[PDB]
């Protein structure tokens, strides 16, 4: 029954400030050092702050440095963290975790929380062409558009064979998105956030 | 951060050993952990103090350090070791948690497949924006990890692009697409444009000229 449960993430504009919270259960608390560790959508893990057994030694990543402080309530079996001055990309996953003392590693962690980092507004896509012997690719980017998702084919559904759509890419605050078609050729797009449909003739 | 390779791969039965690189002040000072990741859940710990397993962590796992590196061995390959693996440090310089930057272990259930690289240039339309988006396309690999790296005039390029995670295709391999953004002007100053993916021990380079 050794648990740390994370809450308090949440979507905050850029600028915005947030506080998260993790609780801790059947352990001691006042007895571990505790730490924060984040990762962004599709990366890898980024070691943000630790808290000693009772707060006399804090440490920051340089990337956080001067705009999270880390706070811990023993009483509460509770351990804190204010972000302040949000940016872009602070957006992640947020995680809680246990230090064991002799060995410095990282034993429990909760379950973590999202935080998100955003002002964007719904906007709906541009969309492009894509064009360049043996065979002929051509295909359609869906720039800048929010929020997810939006919808892609080739001749109305009737082209299938040799087309790929791409996951999507924040690139900004918006996203980004494209489809090609291994072969007159259509891009149908739908964006039903925006209540917008776009019909591209891709020629090369 | 620490240096891992970004993918690591065999049939089930092998073992699979993953490498960690780091520095003087991190891997040379102090002990590695390592961290198992199963896809969309949280990081649990897999090895301390170098070489030590905790209760639930089976003894093909295996850890190594020496000098500024340490090594995750995997004996035995199963379905289920299946995950991004990280390694950790303690940084004296930077009084610092370093991380690797994550190695995806594919348990191989299918032949290898190189990716199939094209590469657009941005079109008329989206310059007229004062905008330029190159897009790098790849599909058909597996394992499903790759690494992208842009070439402007044959210099390395270190801003303005984003790299899709991959993402399962209609016959089972994987697909992602990489991106490239400049400003108009950019793209009109430079005439020499690459994406570079890396598979494995295959690396392909697309190219075009404006």
């Known amino acids: 029954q050794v648990t740390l449960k994370e809450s308090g993430g949440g979507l905050v504009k850029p600028g915005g400030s947030l506080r998260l919270s993790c609780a801790a259960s059947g352990f001691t608390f006042s007895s571990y050092s505790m730490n924060w560790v984040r990762q962004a959508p599709g990366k890898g893990l980024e070691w943000v702050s630790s808290i000693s057994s009772s707060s006399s030694y804090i440490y920051y990543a340089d990337s956080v440095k001067g705009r999270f402080t880390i706070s811990r309530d023993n009483a509460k079996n509770s351990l804190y963290l204010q972000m302040n001055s949000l940016r872009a990309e602070d957006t992640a996953v947020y995680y809680c975790?246990?230090?064991?003392?002799?060995?410095?590693?990282?034993?429990?962690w909760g379950q973590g929380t999202l935080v998100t980092v955003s002002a964007a507004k719904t906007t709906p896509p541009s969309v492009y062409p894509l064009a360049p012997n043996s065979m002929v690719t051509l295909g359609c980017l869906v720039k800048g558009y929010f929020p997810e998702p939006v919808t892609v084919t080739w001749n109305s559904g009737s082209l299938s064979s040799g087309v790929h759509t791409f996951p999507a890419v924040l690139q900004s605050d918006l996203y980004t998105l494209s489809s090609s078609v291994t072969v007159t050729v259509t891009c149908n797009v739908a964006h039903p956030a925006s209540s917008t449909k776009v019909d591209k003739k891709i020629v090369p | 951060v620490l240096t891992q390779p970004p993918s690591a791969s065999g049939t089930p039965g092998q073992r699979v050993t993953i490498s960690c690189s780091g520095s003087s002040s991190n891997i040379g000072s102090n002990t590695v952990n390592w961290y198992q990741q199963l896809p969309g859940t949280a990081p649990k710990l897999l090895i301390y103090?170098?070489?030590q397993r905790p209760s639930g962590v089976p003894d093909r796992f295996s850890g190594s350090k020496s000098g500024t590196s340490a090594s995750l061995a995997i004996s035995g390959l199963q379905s289920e070791d299946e995950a991004d693996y990280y390694c950790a440090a303690w940084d004296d310089s930077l009084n610092a948690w370093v991380f690797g930057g994550g190695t995806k272990l594919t348990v191989l259930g299918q032949p290898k497949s190189s990716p199939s690289v094209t590469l657009f240039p941005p079109s008329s339309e989206e310059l007229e924006t004062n905008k330029a988006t190159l897009v790098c396309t790849i599909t058909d690999f597996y394992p499903g990890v790759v690494t992208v790296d842009w070439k402007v005039d044959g210099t390395p390029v270190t801003q303005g692009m984003e790299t899709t995670q991959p993402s399962k295709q209609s016959n089972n391999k994987y697909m992602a697409s990489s991106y490239l953004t400049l400003t108009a002007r950019a793209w009109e100053r430079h005439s020499s444009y690459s994406c570079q993916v890396t598979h494995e021990g295959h690396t392909v380079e697309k190219s075009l000229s404006r």
């Open positions: 975790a246990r230090q064991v003392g002799a060995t410095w590693a990282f034993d429990i």
């Open positions: 103090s170098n070489n």
